[PDB]
């Protein structure tokens, strides 16, 4: 299977209440493994998955050094964005950054990411060719022109194609029993009349990993897209995920409905019926 | 593995 590593960082300015809060978290696929919080007392990159704890002290020192440098950099970038957008120093603003890589089944590089959002909207993003940028607006174009002239993109390629791929490969082997597992959903159905002529059928997927899943209701073999109530996949809290899909059905007609579950952990997709 | 980030907007 293909795999990904991501780091997600958030800087939030809080004028009059000190310096911006910086939080960064690291993920392999759907599993978090590290975090950094500028407000926390330790000022260390800290483990959040058991298989990363076996990294020696040079790892924790170096990763701490890197993430703290990023926190300083994005602090300054908050101030530059403030000037580019002609915004007052009174308000609270947010700079988000994501970076990482995807690898294929064979562990080889597929994609690298290096991208920012300011106040919740695209700012600048490294494009697929790893040579050019997509800027969202006129303020981001200033940065884009600066970074093109300085060849920022080229200077990130060693990390994206090398360090990131290599690290992801190491984590996937060290966390093999966790990260390469595939837990199929445990499924069931619930049925609740809502009047004397209608009833809810709810199809449940529980305990699955990875989070990617598809739950669809059909009636007499036809997809019920517009009438299905479908909640966002949600964490159980133990490292697995949950989802359900409900349809409101005329009573006595429950047998026309089927819920179809596709998950990478199922040899064949499931068809459930009440 | 984190990356080094030093570039300014």
């Amino acid at each position: 299977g293909s795999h990904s590593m991501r780091y997600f960082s958030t800087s939030v300015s809080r004028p009059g209440r000190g310096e911006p809060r910086f939080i960064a978290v690291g993920y392999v696929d759907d599993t978090q493994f590290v975090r950094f919080d500028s407000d926390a007392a330790s000022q260390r990159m800290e483990p959040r998955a058991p298989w990363i704890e076996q990294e020696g002290p040079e790892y924790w020192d170096e990763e701490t050094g890197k993430v703290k440098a990023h926190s300083q950099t994005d602090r300054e970038n908050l101030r530059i964005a403030l000037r580019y957008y002609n915004q007052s120093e009174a308000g609270s603003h947010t700079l988000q950054m994501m970076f990482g890589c995807d690898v294929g089944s064979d562990g080889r590089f597929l994609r690298g990411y290096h991208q920012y959002a300011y106040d919740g909207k695209d700012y600048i993003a490294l494009k697929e060719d790893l040579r050019s940028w997509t800027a969202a607006d006129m303020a981001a174009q200033i940065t884009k022109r600066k970074w093109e002239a300085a060849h920022v993109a080229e200077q990130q390629r060693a990390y994206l194609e090398g360090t990131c791929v290599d690290g992801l490969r190491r984590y996937l082997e060290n966390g093999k029993e966790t990260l390469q597992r595939t837990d199929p959903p445990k499924t069931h159905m619930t049925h609740h009349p809502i009047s004397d002529h209608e009833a809810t059928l709810r199809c449940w997927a529980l305990g699955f990993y990875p989070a990617e899943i598809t739950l669809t209701w059909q009636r007499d073999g036809e997809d019920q897209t517009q009438d299905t109530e479908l909640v966002e996949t949600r964490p159980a809290g133990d490292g697995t995920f949950q989802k359900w899909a409900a349809v409101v059905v005329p009573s006595g007609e429950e047998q026309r409905y089927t819920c179809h579950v596709q998950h990478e952990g199922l040899p064949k997709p499931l068809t459930l019926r009440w | 593995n984190y990356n080094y980030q030093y570039r300014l907007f």
């Binding site: 978290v25 993920y27 947010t94 919740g120 619930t190 529980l206 966002e232 809290g237 | -």
Partner: protein, 100 residues
Amino acid sequence: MIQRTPKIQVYSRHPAENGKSNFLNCYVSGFHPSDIEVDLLKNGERIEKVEHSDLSFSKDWSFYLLYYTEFTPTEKDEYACRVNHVTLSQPKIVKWDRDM
């Protein structure tokens, strides 16, 4: 700026059985800005020992957080999540339905 109201789900880790240990979850997602307050309520009163996941975000840049606490459901107790966010003119209180 862009401002997105949280989607809220309150649920237990496992299907609830009275008297059996479990976890109570309030998952907030799709919101912006990241400043948010989330409380778990037991019969209207704020539960004191609630933990939360580290702030993260999705491909569209929207934030998500998981708040959770151990608990043991009983017949008499009602649970809710109370979400306080700038997009909400009053905090949103979502009651725990055992089948949602």
